[PDB]
Amino acid sequence: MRECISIHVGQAGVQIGNACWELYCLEHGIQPDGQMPSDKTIGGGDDSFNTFFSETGAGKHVPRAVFVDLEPTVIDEVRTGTYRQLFHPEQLITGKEDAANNYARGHYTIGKEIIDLVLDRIRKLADQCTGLQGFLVFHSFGGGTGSGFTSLLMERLSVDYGKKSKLEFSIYPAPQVSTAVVEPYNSILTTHTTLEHSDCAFMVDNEAIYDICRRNLDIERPTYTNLNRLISQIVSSITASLRFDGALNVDLTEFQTNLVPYPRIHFPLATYAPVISAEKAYHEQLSVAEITNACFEPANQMVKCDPRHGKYMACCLLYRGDVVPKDVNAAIATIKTKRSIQFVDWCPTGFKVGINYQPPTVVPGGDLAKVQRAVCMLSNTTAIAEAWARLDHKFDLMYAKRAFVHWYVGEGMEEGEFSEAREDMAALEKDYEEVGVDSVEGEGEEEGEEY
Amino acid sequence: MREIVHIQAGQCGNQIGAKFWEVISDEHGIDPTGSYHGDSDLQLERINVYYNEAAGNKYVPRAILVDLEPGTMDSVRSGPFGQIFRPDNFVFGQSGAGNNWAKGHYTEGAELVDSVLDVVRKESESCDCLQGFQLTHSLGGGTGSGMGTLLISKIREEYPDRIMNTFSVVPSPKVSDTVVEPYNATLSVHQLVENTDETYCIDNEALYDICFRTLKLTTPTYGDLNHLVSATMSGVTTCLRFPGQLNADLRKLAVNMVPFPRLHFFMPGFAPLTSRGSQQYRALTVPELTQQMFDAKNMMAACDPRHGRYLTVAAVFRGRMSMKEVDEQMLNVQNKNSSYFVEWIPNNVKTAVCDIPPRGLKMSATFIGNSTAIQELFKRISEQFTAMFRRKAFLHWYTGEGMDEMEFTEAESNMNDLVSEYQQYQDATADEQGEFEEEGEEDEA
Amino acid sequence: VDSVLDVVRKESESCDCLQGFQLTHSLGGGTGSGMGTLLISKIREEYPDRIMNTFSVVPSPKVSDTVVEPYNATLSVHQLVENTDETYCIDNEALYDICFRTLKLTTPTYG
Numbered sequence A: 001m002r003e004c005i006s007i008h009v010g011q012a013g014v015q016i017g018n019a020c021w022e023l024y025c026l027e028h029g030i031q032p033d034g035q036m037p038s039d040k041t042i043g044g045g046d047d048s049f050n051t052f053f054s055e056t057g058a059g060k061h062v063p064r065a066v067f068v069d070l071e072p073t074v075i076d077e078v079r080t081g082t083y084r085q086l087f088h089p090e091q092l093i094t095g096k097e098d099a100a101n102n103y104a105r106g107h108y109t110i111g112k113e114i115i116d117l118v119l120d121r122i123r124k125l126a127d128q129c130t131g132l133q134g135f136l137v138f139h140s141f142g143g144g145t146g147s148g149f150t151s152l153l154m155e156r157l158s159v160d161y162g163k164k165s166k167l168e169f170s171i172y173p174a175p176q177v178s179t180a181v182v183e184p185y186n187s188i189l190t191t192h193t194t195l196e197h198s199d200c201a202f203m204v205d206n207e208a209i210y211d212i213c214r215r216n217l218d219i220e221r222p223t224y225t226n227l228n229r230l231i232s233q234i235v236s237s238i239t240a241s242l243r244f245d246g247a248l249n250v251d252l253t254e255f256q257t258n259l260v261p262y263p264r265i266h267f268p269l270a271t272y273a274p275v276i277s278a279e280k281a282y283h284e285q286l287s288v289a290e291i292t293n294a295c296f297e298p299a300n301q302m303v304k305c306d307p308r309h310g311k312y313m314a315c316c317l318l319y320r321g322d323v324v325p326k327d328v329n330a331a332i333a334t335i336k337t338k339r340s341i342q343f344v345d346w347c348p349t350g351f352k353v354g355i356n357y358q359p360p361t362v363v364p365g366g367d368l369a370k371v372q373r374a375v376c377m378l379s380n381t382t383a384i385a386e387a388w389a390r391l392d393h394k395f396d397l398m399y400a401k402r403a404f405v406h407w408y409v410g411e412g413m414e415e416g417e418f419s420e421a422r423e424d425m426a427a428l429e430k431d432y433e434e435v436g437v438d439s440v441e442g443e444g445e446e447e448g449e450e451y
Numbered sequence B: 001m002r003e004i005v006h007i008q009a010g011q012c013g014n015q016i017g018a019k020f021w022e023v024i025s026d027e028h029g030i031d032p033t034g035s036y037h038g039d040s041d042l043q044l045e046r047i048n049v050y051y052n053e054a055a056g057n058k059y060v061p062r063a064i065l066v067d068l069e070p071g072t073m074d075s076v077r078s079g080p081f082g083q084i085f086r087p088d089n090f091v092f093g094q095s096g097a098g099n100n101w102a103k104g105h106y107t108e109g110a111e112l113v114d115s116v117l118d119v120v121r122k123e124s125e126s127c128d129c130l131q132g133f134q135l136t137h138s139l140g141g142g143t144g145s146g147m148g149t150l151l152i153s154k155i156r157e158e159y160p161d162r163i164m165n166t167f168s169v170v171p172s173p174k175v176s177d178t179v180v181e182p183y184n185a186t187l188s189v190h191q192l193v194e195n196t197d198e199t200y201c202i203d204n205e206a207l208y209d210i211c212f213r214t215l216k217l218t219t220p221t222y223g224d225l226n227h228l229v230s231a232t233m234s235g236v237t238t239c240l241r242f243p244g245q246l247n248a249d250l251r252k253l254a255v256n257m258v259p260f261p262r263l264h265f266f267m268p269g270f271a272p273l274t275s276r277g278s279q280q281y282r283a284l285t286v287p288e289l290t291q292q293m294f295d296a297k298n299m300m301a302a303c304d305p306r307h308g309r310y311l312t313v314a315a316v317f318r319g320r321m322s323m324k325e326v327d328e329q330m331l332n333v334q335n336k337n338s339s340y341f342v343e344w345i346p347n348n349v350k351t352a353v354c355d356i357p358p359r360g361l362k363m364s365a366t367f368i369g370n371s372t373a374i375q376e377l378f379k380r381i382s383e384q385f386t387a388m389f390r391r392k393a394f395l396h397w398y399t400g401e402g403m404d405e406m407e408f409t410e411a412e413s414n415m416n417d418l419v420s421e422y423q424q425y426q427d428a429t430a431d432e433q434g435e436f437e438e439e440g441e442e443d444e445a
Numbered sequence C: 001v002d003s004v005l006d007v008v009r010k011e012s013e014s015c016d017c018l019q020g021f022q023l024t025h026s027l028g029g030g031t032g033s034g035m036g037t038l039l040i041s042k043i044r045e046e047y048p049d050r051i052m053n054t055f056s057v058v059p060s061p062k063v064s065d066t067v068v069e070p071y072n073a074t075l076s077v078h079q080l081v082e083n084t085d086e087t088y089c090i091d092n093e094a095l096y097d098i099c100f101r102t103l104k105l106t107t108p109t110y111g
């Protein structure tokens, strides 16, 4: 019909997939062991969510999910957790040794020992999609398997299924926060390999989401369970049009056709709103304008570059729940009219708008805001060229001294691989500079009069 | 699901093991009977990582115990947790090294090592998901040092890509525990450095200082020290053995900690450390953890890290943290102290955060740091060696065990090269190796 | 589109005097634009003297709902201009303003 398939790649992808797949059950009434607790048509009906689940037995749900890190410790938490009896036991996949925060262990040794077991179970899910759209991968660019397996999966999928939607969903490098000494290398060996494959790739940073939780939600203590249980609502707001009815719904293809002027410029940065504390939600007005204002606010962005350092190319601004097309048109006309909120000179048409009737729904187990309506935004902009410039800075100090490179060598990797990934970053730097320019015409050299 | 093997070599390497194994029996619920009686399903989930499942709720440790004296072996088995060590996992001589590193490496310990390797093979063929080996030892000792190194060099011949972790005591700063320390430590290094992936440089006078300073005890013995250390070897392996917000495999820290192939000698540390009459007062927080672990005088190591720059540092937390605060305290301590850091290795940190704390306590963290300040210890031991060696002091005893004068000269040269390198990593700039040039002419002919 | 043309035919052999064709679609849409101008340009070869008439959502001047609007609209108008008989231009920026001004509807819905 309209089927999607998610792959949860490495520790971050997995930790995220546990948040996501609480909410994908919870939206439909589906219980933590796949059960539909009450069904108006046992063996058909609505059930609009066969796009996210395959049905078995007497109306038990099996999800359309995959879990993989070469660490049992993070997958066994799926097979012994609160939801163990939801998922499929040959869809909680491991390997014999975890990837040490390294690329080459993925791409040329140990990921390369598990890729054909994974691609096979993916083939059995795919054949059971009557209307396969494509697949999403959830990762960190800074991850070990995150870098090393996504790359090797999308080298396989993009010529296994081809014209099918190729998506990524990525934890994207923090400006000042870090986790690992080896993140710049993991990121840049994956962009080299995988930016040739995704049609659109959707971006968030932990340093911004920590900010959202400390400011907007007014949480003193963001655990990763506090963080990821926000992100759930991002893909819940992206995926609504495939899960519920409405007025102006958006397939997984249309983000591509609209967010991407050029097929290297397909990394749009997310934000989602409203986000308030359980004190703030009782004094706010939370109308569509006021959401849409907070959606373009620089502090409020889910990748931590200020969009004002950039210029906007394109954007996608989907609305969910209590929302009205004239009221939305009014907020678009407002952000548009404030030209100070800056687009490129050449932009004829920069927007993609949507209406889905089902509201936002939270989780059990917080002091949380049960709002009536929400927006989910993705920004395409030269502001990502500020954080490319940071990867250009991080890389060159390490790689000149040739720090760490022997750990990648000894697990299957060329030296020319690093070099040719940074070469691609030398291109990307400029691929993003040949856009931020104004459309004015002319060439060569002159020093005299025409008049 | 992945499995560790451990080596308890010499007097010290084994005395630390006996208290390490006490700490690691308690963490997995296991009574000194060698059976479980524990307090979580998750202690059993990963009881496999250290232990073999013997029949009828029986566990034995993946420990192999190596010496040329039987003395501490009598004291392990008449000691606490003695009954748990299976008899065939004791493998020892009755003649000793007598402090002579060479009598370990060449004469007696060499006559034992194959019979050891059997016990090592029995263990390694039975854990399919074998990930790495550990050793505890003395560096300045004859036995943990002189035999445990050849054993490591024959472990690395049989298990070529598996992790090798090494938990040294080092020679003593101001006065010696054993006279031949500068030759034992320097002979040892030229076997280690081509056969280990991680080496940890613990200083017993730093543990004696830490005990009078942060724990404020005047009388710390080996049990207080052998517990103070075991939080590092517990710590480093917690994020393998229990779930976390960042789980971490042994390789996951080595591959962050080591930037070049011989640059893998570490300064360990731990928080929090507080006396019994002040645990009521200091705060149980992540800025106290971080600033306790980065206190120059909180290092379990012969060196003041304000003398060097940090190449790399990992930081393993335990207990239930804000991940925001783990990150925000790493961010702060690197903004406050940037000049003690190798500036062409920007962002020098690796975090891991396990959800499961030390016994009956709210929280902790484990530090593994790569300062260049470590060069002060190998400077000492090279200048010391030089003063014994340009005179033939003690050298009759080791040449008496067949070592050629080239063996000590290659060793010293090898150490000297490591030291010369450490200077070349210290305070260095992002330089690109160019030289002075000048202008030509434009008057073409 | 052949499977449709077959149903359009089965409808056309139901009409005693086939008047012609009404369409509702969007020019800023994908399918309404692209698969409708496929259908418009194929009908005309099969139904030469009948009228073929269209009620199009057309791009509006202040805002835009889809980024490829100018491509879709202009690729559309290329076919429509020489295979149709009427083109009723319908615009949501006016529809939203008529609902707000003339009917005093504070919140105009697509309903």
Ligand SMILES: Nc1nc2c(ncn2[C@@H]2O[C@H](COP(=O)(O)OP(=O)(O)OP(=O)(O)O)[C@@H](O)[C@H]2O)c(=O)[nH]1
Residues within 6 Å of the ligand: A009, A010, A011, A012, A015, A016, A069, A070, A071, A098, A099, A100, A101, A102, A140, A141, A142, A143, A144, A145, A146, A147, A171, A179, A180, A183, A206, A224, A227, A228, B245, B246, B247, B252
């Ligand atoms: N948002 C978020 N990021 C996470 C989470 N877990 C870790 N991270 C990030 O993802 C990366 C860490 O993952 P890795 O430890 O490399 O996990 P991996 O991809 O499986 O690599 P190996 O475990 O070595 O296979 C870093 O860039 C982190 O900042 C999580 O649950 N949420």
Ligand SMILES: Nc1nc2c(ncn2[C@@H]2O[C@H](COP(=O)(O)OP(=O)(O)O)[C@@H](O)[C@H]2O)c(=O)[nH]1
Residues within 6 Å of the ligand: B009, B010, B011, B012, B013, B015, B016, B097, B098, B099, B137, B138, B140, B141, B142, B143, B144, B145, B146, B169, B170, B172, B177, B178, B204, B222, B225, B226
């Ligand atoms: N930290 C600590 N150091 C000790 C312990 N027992 C001995 N050592 C130290 O280890 C060194 C002695 O080496 P030893 O292990 O006897 O040499 P070997 O048995 O020949 O390898 C000296 O520095 C002692 O202080 C112990 O259990 N704890």
Ligand SMILES: Nc1nc2c(ncn2[C@@H]2O[C@H](COP(=O)(O)OP(=O)(O)O)[C@@H](O)[C@H]2O)c(=O)[nH]1
Residues within 6 Å of the ligand: A247, A248, A249, C026, C028, C029, C030, C031, C032, C033, C057, C065, C066, C092, C110
């Ligand atoms: N006036 C009107 N326009 C609508 C309605 N729903 C969608 N649209 C518009 O039609 C366009 C959506 O294109 P869509 O129909 O999704 O593309 P298609 O399915 O590929 O033909 C946008 O311009 C929307 O504003 C509606 O009920 N009334």
Ligand SMILES: [Mg+2]
Residues within 6 Å of the ligand: A010, A011, A069, A070, A071, A098, A099, A100, A144, A145
């Ligand atoms: Mg992993």
